[PDB]
Amino acid sequence: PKEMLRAQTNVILLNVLKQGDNYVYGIIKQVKEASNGEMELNEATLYTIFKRLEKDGIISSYWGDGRRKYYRLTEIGHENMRLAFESWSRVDKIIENLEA
Amino acid sequence: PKEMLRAQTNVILLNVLKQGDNYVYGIIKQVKEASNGEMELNEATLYTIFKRLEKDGIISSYWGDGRRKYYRLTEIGHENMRLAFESWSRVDKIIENLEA
Ligand code: HEM
């Protein structure tokens, strides 16, 4: 399901930036390692996602020191992540209660 | 965020039906209890969601024995849930690796 995959990719990318500002190739490498090789993201996929996140004010970009484009979570992006994490956590506990 | 709330509601409703076929008022009651009262879903919200899920072949409906409309996960709906659970579980382990 394409839109769920995009949702999953967005969550992963935001959690990478939560660990620290990063650039596209560094993010790909980190996600490849964290997924034991099972998730090899494409440069162009990240550009597509980051254009939307920047438009929405969730992340911002800035140049490093061949200069790399770095991305950072914004203050709004951090707050949105925390709200999402807390509400999905409540969902998890609801589902836990529905089973046993 | 409205679309994330809808995503959360969909997941909860599908997990209710995973526990057994059910009807709208019974589902509301179960979700209210499982959320310790914090999630009181509206009849009309469930109708909206169930119209889409039925259209998509994820659930189907049938009459009980004042007769209630019962809903069941379909074979496709069960398979979609399992695939979603497995892939989001992989996401969780990816995020775990990104932290420590
Ligand atoms: C860790 C925090 C999580 C976030 C931020 C998150 C976010 C999202 C988003 C954004 C979507 C798609 C809806 C949209 O893009 O508007 C989605 C879909 C979904 N999530 Fe999560 N999610 C999280 C955790 C979980 C967990 C723990 C489960 C386990 C039950 C789960 C199950 C699902 C399912 C089944 C869908 C598919 C919804 C559909 O196809 O309609 N998610 N999630």
Structure description:
Two copies of one chain form a homodimer. Chain A is an alpha+beta fold and 100 residues long. The first copy, chain A, has a single domain (1-100), classed as Winged helix-like DNA-binding domain superfamily/Winged helix DNA-binding domain (Arc Repressor Mutant, subunit A), CATH 1.10.10. The first copy, chain A, contains four helices and three strands. Chain A has helices at residues 2-19, 24-34, 43-55, 75-99, and strands spanning 22-23, 59-63, 69-73. Chain A has a three-stranded antiparallel sheet with strand order 1-3-2. The longest helix of chain A has 25 residues, at 75-99. Chain A is globular. Protoporphyrin IX containing FE sits between chains A (4, 7, 11, 84-85, 88, 92) and B (3-4, 7, 10-11, 84, 88). It is classed as dna binding protein.
What's the helix and strand layout?
The structure is a homodimer.
Chain A: H1 2-19, E1 22-23, H2 24-34, H3 43-55, E2 59-63, E3 69-73, H4 75-99
Antiparallel strand pairs in A: 1-3, 2-3
Protoporphyrin IX containing FE sits at the interface of chains A and B.
Please report the distance between the alpha carbons of the first and last residues of chain A. Answer: 29 Å
Q: Largest interface: which pair?
A: A-B, 28 and 28 residues
Largest sheet of chain A: 3 strands, antiparallel
- The percent range for strand residues of chain A is 5-15%
Radius of gyration of chain A: 15 Å
Count of helices of chain A? 4
Biggest β-sheet: strands ordered side by side in the sheet of chain A: 1-3-2
Associated small molecules? protoporphyrin IX containing FE
How many domains, in number, for the residues of chain A?
1
Summing up helix and strand content along with how strands pair, one would put the structural category of chain A as alpha+beta
Which CATH architecture of chain A would you pick?
Orthogonal Bundle
The helix fraction of chain A, in percent, is 55-70%
- The backbone outline of chain A, from C-alpha atoms, is globular
Order of helices and strands of chain A: HEHHEEH
> What's the CATH class label of chain A?
Mainly Alpha
Oligomeric composition of the shown chains: homodimer
Fill in the CATH topology of chain A: Arc Repressor Mutant, subunit A
Number of strands of chain A: 3
CATH superfamily of chain A: Winged helix-like DNA-binding domain superfamily/Winged helix DNA-binding domain
